[model samples]
Target chain A: MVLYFIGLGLYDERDITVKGLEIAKKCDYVFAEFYTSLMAGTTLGRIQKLIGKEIRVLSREDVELNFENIVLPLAKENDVAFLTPGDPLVATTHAELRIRAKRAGVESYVIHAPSIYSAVGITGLHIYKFGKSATVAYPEGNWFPTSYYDVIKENAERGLHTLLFLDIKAEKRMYMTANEAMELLLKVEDMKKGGVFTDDTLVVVLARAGSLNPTIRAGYVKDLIREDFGDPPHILIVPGKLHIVEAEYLMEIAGAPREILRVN
Target chain B: MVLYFIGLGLYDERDITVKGLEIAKKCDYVFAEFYTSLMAGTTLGRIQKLIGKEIRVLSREDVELNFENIVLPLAKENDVAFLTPGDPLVATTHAELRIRAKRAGVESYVIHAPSIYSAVGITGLHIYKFGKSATVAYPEGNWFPTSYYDVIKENAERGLHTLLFLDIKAEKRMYMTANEAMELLLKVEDMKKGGVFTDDTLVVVLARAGSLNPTIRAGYVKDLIREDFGDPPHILIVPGKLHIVEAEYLMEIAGAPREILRVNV
Candidate 1:
């Protein structure tokens, strides 16, 4: 009587680890929810075919509201596998579900996969240099989000990089692009005038991580905001002061500006 | 024509992703080094059997000094795989290896796996709350390192969690435990007197992360320093302000003290 929280990696069905695929196939019931993040590369049909099961896709409400009634009840009598995007626990909401599993007397364990959180390393920025992370959300009518700009300000204040998770409406298939993220930041800069994000600000864009030949580019916001990063699931990184080695790597690898080589 | 850097996951050989295992087996040559971090739960032999290739185990000197010379030349004519414990780029050292590959005209792709950085989420701490990471080194002769202590102090001040990676001497076959890390922090407190780490400071210890039955314990330094947390490959976290949800999870899952349920708001 157990439940498995399996992360389906970054892009495709094949990204699931050998260990995760084995345990998922042996489960009596397999239920997945994709609302947290999108697996942009593969389809539900492909993922279901990989695990060799009739995958039941759960909505956000189905999971957040009825996890115990719908999923945990099955776990009481049989092995149940609950699949999510990226590392299951990296998403704080999913981590809290384990508490629900515990209270219901259902044993649970997490199976990690490559997440944008870690996969952002592809951008050639030092992973340890990253401070706290924040997501950029689409503003509703008469409501705007400027908190993400402040996250970057705080991180840069300490000479730390900021990893910004662009907003995604998985249900409606709406994914925020790095261009849109930069646009939002610039608009926020107009109101707050914090000199946080400007056209001259250097930024990094990583698209379709976990896939070979995914887009990796670094430049000023003016140059990058219009550049085609290709496909959904884009992440933006604003680096702090650059070490010589870090600057050289960005220049040699990501085509960052020659001026950045002098950014001490 | 290509070089692949694969992560062997957190604990054992089985932790390799299906994609990583397939690509590793097809490679013309396989090279690995265990000096950065230890795979305490599995052996080199087991990893070799999983990939069905003879892995040439390299030392830190071999990789740091001669990776471009040794590993890149093979990629010119055939697919060569370089394997490391956890995600290749997370170590920072491995991240620069790609620059070497580019310089040598070798194309490289990183096959991602779970990392202690992300795997720390299993401890119920918000992954985003983690600040910059630091390493705790053993006091060698008279050269004691207190940088890790300062890292915790800085993070705690910002209301951020600090992830402390314990040191390892692969040649000496020595790995510093979470308990030893605590002792060192306590020692640093005596000298720095920053009131950063004390017997009363709360912390979390994670051991054998990728394993199903990993040891996760949370408490003050006084109680945790002597607590047996099983084997090596331990990670420590000094949490800042805690959300009630975070404290509850540690209490229910990690067996933390009841007083911790009431953290300062």
Candidate 2:
């Protein structure tokens, strides 16, 4: 028995590679999980039409807790497919599923696709300068998390860019927009007073990447905190010192202020 | 009257996404460059057959020096596609081309595909932990490039993983293997004596990532330095601290040593 891990590339149904699509067409059963990241471009009916399979959707509990019980049993005798948004193993806890597959004596293979981790290059920043990444979570009740603020502080101190992944609640259909992330970061800065995120901080916002007409904007937080970036899914970036070319592209393409041309 | 910057994905022709393929098929002209990275799986003929277009190959000189003169001239009146081995803007100089296009009054749209930068997830190392990346360049007679060695040292000190891209001379068909990369790092260690990459240091090698059967190996340099990791276009990662789940996946899937499961307290 064989199990294939396929990545549904960012955005839409047509984003799946020919290799992944061809394999999924021949699979006996196809399973997908979308809780890790948002795929705002396509719908269940669209993806099923493309793959020509009756897709079985799995909740976070069904996957994290009962993957062995719900998915592994059919994978024992059938060629099963497990699909996820972005690259399959890029998620924090998904790699452990391979160990489970090994214990069940099932062979596993990964089919790669475009991930936001790499898609950020479209923002005109050098991919190599990106340091440690952090996720901005929705602060609830008394558990106000500020670790992401410290991440940006540490990265900027070293002249390295920081990639901030916005929070998402799939069941609630709540995706944190760039505006919310900026507001939250400002709150953390006010409490911690680290000068990590200020009204003068320059940030980049990218929405609906992998689409033909994604929104890419770069400006000061005070100017863009309330600015519209189109739809539900959005990711933010806090860049360090920029090269001349990086600044030029941002100005020419992303409408970054002319003042950014003179890097500090 | 539109320009499409399409990624050919990693490894082979089939690695390109359906969206990229459909866009490329409708283009009046198709152009490609292969010097940034190696595509070891597919050939020129195979890609041409799949897209049903005659691809005009461009050199580094053509792209960087005369991108406006050569590519933009045709893009003014006809729909054109510029294909690269990975995501279009991921390379250093490639992003500047968009600036060139804007100056020439040509519109461009990017169609994304699988990139080895993200495909390293198959190695089981967390992507977020990767620090600044470097390329291991070949040392010439008077120029000994050792900056990549320092990258490992800096990342290791911060408990971050360093991604090392090995050297490649596409015209010469010279791809620096993972074995050669290890030897070069060991030599740098001897020269700098930083204790960054020693014979006992652990490393991971990933080859032909998008292929059905890729080579994923992880172990100490003393054991795996001489090991065969298949073809070229190899990427090396020097991890600092390991998570338990990371270590377990490395042990089970990548065949990392069992002793790694016990983290140093």
Candidate 3:
């Protein structure tokens, strides 16, 4: 008799919390969508076998547009679970979904999970040092999103790291690589001439986080823009001033150049 | 044959992820510490029973000073799990542990869990708008940690929310309540005369976040300082301004005063 908004955590099926798994198991119906973020490590078959439930995968339109009509009706007389790749409400759209559930008189409870918002800790950057987050959206037609560049600038002003989420075109199987994001940033730099993103700017790229052997590389855009870190989903970091220890970690762990060890 | 940094998640043993629990169970030795943050909903015995592993509860010294000497040695031969209340490396000290593991030639991996860092998303404030975080540390003798106050100011200037992590003296069994944190902020404002904090300032309090029925309240400092949010381990959020939807969530869900629903600008 309720709608359970559950976050599947980062990466794969096993990443869901023990509590989440138990609740999803007891629920009468299961619905999930992967348009928000990709599960780089596991497939639908793996997840279905693990949960022992046949999940009906919803499209972005089905979730954002027809959620109340399609999903909430199931929760009226039976427990229904709606799943997302990362923490449920971290995305503004899902937060709105919770509001929609409330409007429909359906009681909703959130089952939280680990998001890249916190998984950025794997970068060895101080979690508290991170500032506002932004995503690089694909420019289509007359729409171009350059606010993310300004996010980097504002964060840099206060010596805070900016976590840049790259664009994902899931349907087309097109995920914006960090190199593509850098090229876009360079184009924006050419248009705005802000010098916020330059060939000399230091950056960190994290690929396939939540995996055992995830790729973590840190260096200047000049050498890294063409560098290969592997596979689809890629996240970029524009660090502000680096801590002495943070620099050491980037150097020793991520193979950052020795010159970046100096305070910039 | 590796060291695993596992988070027990926000409130209890069940908050641990499936992957984390499975890995923790397979470990040869399991070590956990509670001094970093409190797990209000579960006990040590409960976690041991849930994982079916004899847990060695580490004191602050056990983790900070002798992690290499004590824990790394075991990981060289058997899988060793180091447990904490939140995501392991979010704490500055945990990063150093990884460095120590590298020096000791022990391979390591992190098993993530729900943390207050993301739990704040439930507050209805957009998660991406949060800026740098700070802990409201208890003052001792002549040392006052007012940096947290400045952090709010910096975030506010850019229309960003500031997450205040209340101090926890776990050894003394003292967890700072959001009320206590508010009073301290008022006192700091009294001394600095910055007008940064006052009875009029709006704040959000989150208590028992991982539980099914968490207490979420938002309002002016005057009203909230006296408001009773169920239990210990309360967190405070000083929002710069609110999106209409954020204001609505606070009002409808947290019983925030209607005045908060209006856009700040």
Judging by DockQ against the true structure, name the best candidate.
2
Candidate 1 similarity to native, TM-score: 0.98
DockQ of each: 0.76, 0.84, 0.75
Two-way TM-score contest, 1 vs 3, winner = 1
Off by over 4 Å in 2: B263-265
* Residue-wise C-alpha lDDT for candidate 2, range B1-265, written one tens digit per residue: 9889999999999988999999999999999999887678999999999999999999999999999988888887899999999787999888899889988999999999888889998888888888888999889999998999998888888788899888899888888999999999999999999999998888999999999999999899999998988878799999888877778888898899987766410
Residues A41-149 of candidate 3 have per-residue lDDT tens digits of: 9998888888889999999999878999999999989999998887888754687777788888998998888887888887888989999989987889988789999
TM-score of 2: 0.98
TM-score of each: 0.98, 0.98, 0.97
Once fitted onto the true fold, the runs of candidate 1 whose alpha carbons sit more than 4 angstroms away are none
For residues B1-265, write the lDDT of model 3, one tens digit per residue: 8999998988988999999999999999999998888789999999999999999999999888999888999987899999988777888767878888888899999988988889899988998899999999889998987999999888988889999999988999988889899999999999888777889888999998888788899899989888898788899999988888888888877788898766352
**Candidate 1, residues A41-117: lDDT per residue as tens digits?**
89999998889988888998998899999999999999999998888888547778889999999999888887888
Residue pairs in clash, model 1 = A18-B18
